[PDB]
Design a protein around this ligand. Structure first.
Ligand code: 335
Length: 289
């Protein structure tokens, strides 16, 4: 498979020449820009975790509710890869109900969390799901109830089964929560293997299938590690769908993705890691004969 050796040789070359930073800065400065007027309305200020991270008006997710339909969340639809994702911020203490409301309305089956719950700090996230099976939580504003059904804690991530119920209709659905616990803000996962294993667990669960609503992906701001996660998944899908893997251009795919939500992939190391996981990941998908 000389085609992979090439990419690897290229990757090695970029590593040698120390040009990941330059490649990344080139990509980000060609990023598109769109309005975020709704995110900037005075009434939505307390719904945004970060002043400068906002969903574009054209791709933001709307809550089918009365008062305010706003949530800092964006729909990323990748046409060629045949995959959609909803990227959002780690829930605020006042937006946890909106968060589950969105999961319901969009019929999402899975939630991928890539950050850690933080009570203090400028990079945090509220405890939006039950820590204890016996202590379920009710979101009064959106009339929803959620219960932890199961939990399987592993080394790099935790998989949970939750049960969400619309109190207005007594209906209930099973939501899978995949929490990668060792991914620091502005950092990279423990390792490619670790990341790929987590990603494969999410895939095999069916949470990403078109049958359900888009998987909801978030970290703290919903752009750096969420951006890295989605880019890798997307490129993997493309290398398998396309006749030749080497034809996948990380820059072009990242730019396409950035049309839907700003700042996806926050550091050059995240970009490099992204391509490293795609190289290794794609090798796996085509070699277990
Ligand atoms: O994995 P993630 O997504 O959770 C992350 F860790 F990468 C992340 C954490 C925090 C921020 C908001 C930030 C910094 C910031 C602001 C705007 C952007 C952007 F997308 F708009 P850009 O196009 O410029 O690349 C990017 C980064 C922050 C950094 C450090 C500490 C706290 C918050 N932020 N948001 N608003 C800010 C106002 C002042 C300073 C920093 C701000 C952004 C990303």
């Amino acid at each position: 498979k000389l085609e992979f050796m090439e990419m690897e040789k290229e990757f090695e070359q970029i590593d040698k020449s120390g040009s990941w930073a330059a490649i990344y800065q080139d990509i980000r400065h060609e990023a598109s820009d769109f309005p975020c007027r709704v995110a900037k309305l005075p009434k939505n200020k307390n719904r945004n975790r970060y002043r400068d991270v906002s969903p574009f008006d054209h791709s933001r997710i709307k809550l089918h509710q009365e008062d305010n339909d706003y949530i800092n969340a964006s729909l990323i639809k990748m046409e060629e890869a045949q995959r959609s994702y909803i990227l959002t911020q780690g829930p605020l203490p006042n937006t946890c109900g909106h968060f589950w409301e969105m999961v319901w309305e969009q019929k999402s089956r899975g939630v991928v969390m890539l950050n850690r719950v933080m009570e203090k700090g400028s990079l945090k996230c509220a405890q939006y799901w039950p820590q204890k099976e016996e202590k379920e939580m009710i979101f009064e504003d959106t009339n929803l109830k959620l219960t932890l059904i199961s939990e399987d804690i592993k080394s790099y991530y935790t998989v949970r089964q939750l049960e969400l119920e619309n109190l207005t209709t007594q209906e209930t659905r099973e939501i899978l929560h995949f929490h990668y616990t060792t991914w620091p803000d502005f950092g990279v996962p423990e390792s490619p293997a670790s990341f790929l294993n987590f990603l494969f667990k999410v895939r095999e669960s069916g949470s990403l299938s078109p049958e359900h609503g888009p998987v909801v992906v978030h970290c703290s701001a919903g752009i750096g590690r969420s951006g890295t996660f989605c880019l890798a998944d997307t490129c993997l899908l493309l290398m398998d769908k396309r006749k030749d893997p080497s034809s996948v251009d990380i820059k072009k795919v990242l730019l396409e993705m950035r049309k839907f939500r700003m700042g996806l992939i926050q550091t050059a190391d995240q970009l490099r890691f992204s391509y490293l996981a795609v190289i290794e990941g794609a090798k796996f998908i085509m070699g277990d004969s």
